């Protein structure tokens, strides 16, 4: 399968997903690297590893729509199969998930249902669990709902900070994205025509 990977920031996930595309027998390769935001470290780490990438800049579109359009545009000029979302902040409209359907992944670092939105770790120390996590999903509409591939359960340690806990779960996604990545591209794992996810 053909990838991109959307991103807004460091990429650490992006690099996960390069490393394992490379391993042998490989179901999948990334192709385009897409941030909506110039100049994050994400960007080097593409251009590093030889994959092309592109900066389209949100705040320069009238709505949601037009910048999706614009990211859409690009991934049929690279003829992609499969989208991951590896760090990327801007919620995507309506249109966009539905022609990007079973197809889409996100990494979002909390067990789901629990702690959605991005500030998953701020809420999971609020709330004082002491078992947190990471997921892989597809992307639905409803923000951090879609249906979940994979999740790997990671401790809360006493004294933990949002950087100390964001660390440890950051070992896990890169584990289970990679992971989920290749359960996708290899068609193992499907969404099903009754929106439920499916083994084969």
């Given amino acids: 399968a053909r990838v991109a990977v959307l991103i807004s920031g460091t990429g650490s996930n ?62 049929e000029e690279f003829s992609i199969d499969i989208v991951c979302l590896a760090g990327f902040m801007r919620i995507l409209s309506g249109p966009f998930v539905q022609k990007w359907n079973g197809k889409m992944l996100n990494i979002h670092p909390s067990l789901l249902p629990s702690f959605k939105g991005s500030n998953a770790h701020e809420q999971a120390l609020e709330t004082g669990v002491t078992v947190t996590g990471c997921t892989v999903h597809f992307v639905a509409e409803d923000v951090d709902a879609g249906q979940i591939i994979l999740q790997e359960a990671v401790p809360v340690k006493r004294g933990d900070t949002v950087a100390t806990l964001s660390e440890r779960v950051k070992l896990a996604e890169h584990k289970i994205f990679p992971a989920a990545l290749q359960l996708v591209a290899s068609g193992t794992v499907q969404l099903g025509e009754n929106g439920k996810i499916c083994w084969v």
């Fill in 14 to 75: 992006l690099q996960a997903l390069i490393d394992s595309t490379r391993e042998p027998n490989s179901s999948a390769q990334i192709d385009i690297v897409i941030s909506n935001k110039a100049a994050v470290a994400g960007l080097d780490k593409a251009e590093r590893a030889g994959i092309p990438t592109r900066v389209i800049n949100h705040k320069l579109y009238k709505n949601r729509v037009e910048f999706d359009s614009a990211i859409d545009l690009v991934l």
